[PDB]
């Protein structure tokens, strides 16, 4: 020992002298002259018992090297080996199997590649085995089954392949088995279900296939079970209801089928249940209401049918409830939202009908609520008017009705609402002014009338406004310049009137501008030339007037323009060359007059043009769009002559 | 899904002091209620326009798993790096706007896989290479413009590059004509 520490330390210095870049980490520099036991007292990461090495701890110390000159033949008393968080490279030598008293064996994050040598099976006294975060490949040897005293296996995030060995059935003292983020394959051995001490088993993110072994009914003390993102199949065995100590079962993103077994109601301690993205079918078992400690429940994206049971009224602690993207139908029970502390409710893309219950926000803590694409009807409840915690709300595609100014209230922390395709009527209120951090407001295709309150412009965090296909009236003020964060403004299909406000020119983030099918009647703002991001603008079907302003041709990023069904006049200018991105031009049904400029022989992006039913004359330009324009874009005009190949009802040009 | 995860990877690789990617939430099912991103009629992204928004950083290779994206706009920003090769996997793409940046490296040759492309704007950068000449294999190619970065060596005149003008490739150290 003390005399043998001579050879031990000499080998240790010889190994150390093989590293590279040791200068930065002067921590390992404390290895100095081997003498009468001074190194035990002064050498870092080393401990001796009775004068011989016992532990090698070198965490996070910046070492660089390999395991070529490791003294396998000089260290018969090494018992603890931890070399995590370094840059050791190479392979794992079989000689590692010759340490007779090794207990803790860690070779975590490193450069290690290659196989896993079978001879590690000789480690009769090994207790914890970590080979995490490496590039190991090959398979897992069956000789692992000879380690009858190991209690923790961690080999995840390597490049393993092949099947799970069946000899794992004899690892009779396992507790934690982590095999996630590897490329395993095959089927789960049934003997895995006969382990009397598992408490954590992770097989997620693999290519396991086949069916879950029903012997999983024998795992009487497992507290966690992850298998998501695999290729399982078959049906969830009913014996899965005897894992009576579970609190987190997740099996999402698989290829399972059949019905959900009712026996899941027998697990009192279950708190999380993930089963989305599968092919389950049938009806919800009422017994799913007998899980009194249930917090999260996600059964989205499946093929379930039938009614939602009333027994969900007994789930007092629910916080998340995901039922979206299914084929459930019928009415909605009052017990679905009974719980006080519910916070998310996701019920869209189903076939529900009827009225919303009167317990929607009973506890006053709801935050997220989606109901898209159902057949709900009637008025919104009144407990949802005074629910003061909403963040994201979606009502799109339904048949709610009532007064818009009476249906809602004030929401300090709302930032997204979508109420399109419904049957609300009334006038907008000024309560929306008090949602200061609101970002989107979509209210399209309803029966709303009235005028837009000035308070609607107090909002400066707004970024998308959509009040389209309604019966709004009035005129747009100048304080419209105040929003200035908006990038998508849709106000078409209404009865707005007056001038186009010049304040729009102060908007700079504007991308999408839809101002059509209204009764605006005044000159286009001659100062619209400071929109360096706009790519779409539709001002069709209006009562506009005197000649198009050339400032519109400094809209550099324009791609679609529609000045159609108006009372425009004059001549089209030659500044349209500057539009180097435009590819759609609807310019018909006006009094545009004169000749179409020839300089249009320069924009190669044009594909569709329409100048029909105007007062134009003269030859068409030499562009592919005019080359390939059907007859339906040239009628009604005076003297448009054309070429023989591009003959579409037009008189041959002289 | 997958488009959402690719766009989230793009978000993580950039820096934005103006907070223009604030709404890009990786928690939703689909990236169709995000701003500056437009989806198709059946939940598939078709435009990603983010130009003149003062972004700084590096592109990533995940941009290539947006199978149905038609428009890509990133011009007039402060991105540095090289153009990935996986951009050749965007089989249905019409326009590529990538100018007024600090891109480096060579132009990938895989850009010849894109048959429906109509607009290339890479100009005013620092790119160095040989104009791989596979671009003459797309044949749609209405306009191309790269005219401030050194691409020394040749201007191909295969069937495609026969209608262009010297105003492109200007100030680029080419001079084969």
């Amino acid at each position: 020992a003390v005399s043998a520490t001579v050879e031990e330390a000499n080998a240790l210095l010889k190994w150390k002298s093989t590293f590279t870049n040791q200068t930065s980490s002067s921590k390992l520099s404390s290895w100095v002259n081997p003498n009468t036991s001074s190194f035990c007292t002064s050498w870092y990461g080393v401990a001796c018992s009775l004068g011989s090495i016992i532990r090698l701890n070198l965490t996070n110390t910046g070492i660089e090297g390999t395991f070529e000159d490791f003294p396998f033949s000089s260290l018969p008393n090494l018992t603890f080996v931890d070399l995590s968080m370094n840059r050791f490279s190479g392979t794992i030598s079989p000689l590692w199997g010759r340490f007779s008293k090794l207990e803790y064996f860690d070779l975590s994050i490193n450069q290690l590649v290659g196989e896993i040598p079978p001879e590690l099976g000789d480690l009769s006294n090994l207790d914890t085995l970590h080979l995490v975060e490496n590039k190991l490949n090959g398979s897992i040897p069956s000789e692992i089954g000879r380690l009858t005293k190991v209690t923790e296996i961690a080999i995840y995030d390597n490049l393993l392949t092949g099947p799970i060995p069946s000899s794992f059935g004899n690892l009779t003292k396992l507790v934690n088995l982590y095999l996630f983020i590897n490329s395993l394959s095959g089927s789960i051995p049934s003997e895995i279900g006969n382990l009397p001490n598992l408490r954590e088993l992770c097989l997620d993110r693999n290519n396991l296939t086949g069916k879950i072994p029903s012997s999983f009914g024998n795992l009487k003390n497992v507290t966690l079970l992850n298998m998501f993102e695999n290729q399982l199949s078959g049906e969830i065995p009913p014996e899965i209801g005897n894992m009576t100590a579970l609190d987190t079962l997740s099996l999402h993103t698989n290829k399972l089928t059949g019905p959900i077994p009712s026996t899941l109601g027998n697990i009192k301690t279950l708190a999380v249940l993930h089963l989305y993205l599968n092919q389950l079918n049938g009806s919800i078992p009422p017994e799913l209401g007998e899980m009194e400690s249930m917090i999260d429940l996600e059964i989205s994206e499946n093929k379930l049918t039938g009614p939602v049971p009333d027994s969900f009224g007994k789930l007092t602690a629910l916080e998340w409830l995901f039922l979206r993207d299914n084929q459930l139908s019928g009415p909605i029970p009052p017990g679905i939202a009974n719980s006080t502390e519910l916070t998310v409710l996701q019920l869209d893309t189903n076939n529900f009908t009827g009225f919303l219950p009167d317990t929607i926000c009973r506890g006053g803590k709801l935050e997220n609520l989606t109901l898209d694409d159902n057949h709900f009807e009637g008025p919104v409840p009144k407990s949802l008017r005074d629910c003061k915690s909403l963040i994201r709300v979606r009502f799109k595609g339904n048949s709610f009705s009532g007064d818009i100014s009476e249906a809602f209230g004030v929401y300090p922390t709302l930032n997204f609402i979508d109420l399109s395709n419904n049957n609300f009527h009334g006038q907008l209120s000024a309560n929306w002014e008090q949602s200061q951090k609101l970002v989107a407001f979509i209210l399209s295709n309803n029966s709303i009338t009235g005028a837009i309150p000035p308070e609607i412009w107090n909002m400066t965090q707004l970024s998308q406004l959509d009040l389209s296909s309604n019966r709004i009236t009035g005129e747009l003020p100048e304080s419209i310049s105040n929003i200035n964060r908006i990038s998508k403004l849709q106000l078409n299909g209404n009865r707005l009137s007056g001038k186009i406000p010049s304040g729009i020119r102060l908007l700079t983030n504007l991308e999408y501008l839809d101002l059509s099918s209204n009764r605006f009647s005044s000159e286009i703002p001659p100062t619209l030339n400071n929109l360096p991001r706009l790519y779409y603008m539709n001002l069709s079907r209006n009562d506009l007037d005197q000649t198009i302003p050339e400032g519109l041709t400094k809209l550099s990023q324009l791609q679609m323009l529609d000045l159609s069904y108006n009372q425009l006049d004059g001549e089209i200018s030659s500044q349209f060359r500057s539009l180097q991105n435009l590819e759609r031009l609807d310019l018909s049904h006006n009094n545009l007059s004169g000749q179409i400029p020839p300089s249009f022989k320069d924009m190669l992006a044009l594909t569709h043009v329409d100048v029909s039913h105007n007062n134009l004359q003269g030859p068409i330009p030499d562009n592919a769009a005019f080359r390939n324009a059907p007859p339906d874009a040239f009628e009604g005009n005076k003297d448009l002559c054309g070429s023989v190949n591009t003959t579409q009802g037009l008189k041959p040009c002289s | 899904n997958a488009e959402g995860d690719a766009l989230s990877a793009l978000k993580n690789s950039l820096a934005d002091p103006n907070k223009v990617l604030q709404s890009w939430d990786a928690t939703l099912v689909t990236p169709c209620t995000w701003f500056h991103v437009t989806c198709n009629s059946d939940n598939s992204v078709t435009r990603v326009d983010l130009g003149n928004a003062n972004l700084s950083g590096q592109l990533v290779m995940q941009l290539g798993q947006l199978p149905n994206l038609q428009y890509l706009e990133l011009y007039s920003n402060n991105i540095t790096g090289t153009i990935p090769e996986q951009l050749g996997n965007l089989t249905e793409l019409v326009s590529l706007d990538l100018y007024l940046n600090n891109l480096s490296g060579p132009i990938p040759s895989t850009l010849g896989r894109l048959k429906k492309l109509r607009f290339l704007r890479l100009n005013n950068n620092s790119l160095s290479g040989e104009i791989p000449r596979s671009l003459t294999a797309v044949l749609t190619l209405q306009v191309l413009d790269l005219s401030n970065n050194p691409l020394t060596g040749d201007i191909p005149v295969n069937g495609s590059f026969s209608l262009f003008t010297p105003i492109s490739f200007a100030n680029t150290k080419l001079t084969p004509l």
């Binding site: 970590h130 992850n226 999380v272 993930h274 996701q346 | 899904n1 689909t30």
Partner: peptide, 13 residues
């Protein structure tokens, strides 16, 4: 350190 896996949540709309 070595840890258990963690399951994410289903996407919302």
């Amino acid at each position: 350190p070595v840890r258990s896996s963690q399951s994410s949540q289903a996407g919302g709309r």
